[PDB]
Structures are given as C-alpha cells and as structure tokens.
Symmetry: C2
Subunit: 121 residues, 2 copies
C-alpha cells in the first residue's frame, strides 16, 4: 500500500517521501504519467508501469509485509500480486535513492500541463 | 478531479495544495479517513465523507467546470455527480481556508498509519 511505499522511500532515500516525491516532475505523485523530466522522474514512471502490470491486488490500498534486513528491503509475501507490488515499491525506492544525486527541487510541484504524453508502458 | 480540487484549495487558501494539504493529518491526502487531528484535518475528513455520496462519477479523475467569480468558487452546471463533486471540493477548499488559523505544520506529513479508525460519516 502507499504506506509501505512511503516507508520504503524514506528508508532508501532518507527523504520525506511526500515532500520529496509526492509531486515531482511528471510521474512522481498523484497525477498519472508523462515523459520523465529526469532520472528521479523516470523511476516514478517505471513504478507506475510496474503498478499498471499488476493484477489481483490493489497497489494503493493493499498492505503487505516486508522487512528491513541488513538495510535492505526484503519483500515477505508469497502471494504473487502482493509480492510483485512489494517489489514494484522496493524498486522505486531503490531507484529514487540511486538518483538522489540528480534530484532537482525545481521539479517539485511541477505543472502537469508542461509534461509530453507518456509512452505506453 | 484532483486538478480542480488543488486549484480550488490554492485559490481559497493561497497555499501550495500539495505541500500544505497533500499529506496533512489523518485525512488530507492519500487513502481514507482517520480521527481528525485538528480543524484543518476535519475539513479533509468531511471532504472524504462528501465523496462517499457521489455515485456516477470519479472524484479523482473526472474533470468538471467551475469559475472564480468575485473571489468565490462557483460550480458549473455539470451533471448531478460532477456538480456535487465540485461542491464537495469547494467546501473543503473553503474549510481549509477557514481553518488556516490553526494549521500546524507538525501535522504536515502526519504518520497516517498511527491515525485512529474514523467514525462513520
């Protein structure tokens, strides 16, 4: 669920997930997808494509189990959707961390109408 | 849709809606309701309750028309559901503005998991 996602993002990035990624570029946040503004934004693009491939469980709402073991996110689900969901979220969190070095505040609260339409996933 | 809602909040409140209300307390932002932390949060609580009476339309995605007339939000004729959606959104923007006096940044990014379950609307 969004709670696990936020937690993982915090855990990987050390950043307030809502503040940093609740509205960032064309893909991180409440609005759908768009051509990515930068690597951070592309992470969110991939994540949204990850979610859109999922069936059997609600990516936003459904809780799942995971653990933080040797500072790694370990997805603790057997159930294919919740596991896949967990891995979607872990991947974005890792991606966001990986790309903190190009994170640019100027893309925070980016205006959606400034975004090219996203390619199909 | 969230676009109209955010614009209304900005208009009433003068605040970046994502920043101030995208994750505030137990009710403003993602997912459902929780026992409100303060008046601002209760606005969002009432708003989410308001969304429940909507039937033939999607609050998050569906666009509707409104205008800013003499610095008031005036909902467009729209169909029944969109009209009521618009009025839900207008009401929360107004409420948020009314309660700016007790807005507390400490509740910005409140840990929503720790919220009590909401009462019935």
């Amino acid at each position: 669920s969004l709670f696990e996602l936020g937690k993982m993002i915090l855990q990987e990035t050390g950043k307030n997930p809502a503040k940093s990624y609740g509205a960032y570029g064309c893909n991180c946040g409440v609005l759908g997808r768009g051509k990515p503004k930068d690597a951070t934004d592309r992470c969110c693009y991939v994540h949204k494509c990850c979610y859109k491939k999922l069936t059997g469980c609600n990516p936003k709402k459904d809780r799942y189990s995971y653990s933080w073991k040797d500072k790694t996110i370990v997805c603790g689900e057997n159930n294919s959707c919740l596991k896949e969901l967990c891995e979607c979220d872990k991947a974005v969190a890792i991606c966001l961390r990986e790309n903190l070095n190009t994170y640019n505040k100027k893309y925070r609260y980016y205006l959606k109408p400034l975004c090219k339409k996203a390619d199909a996933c």
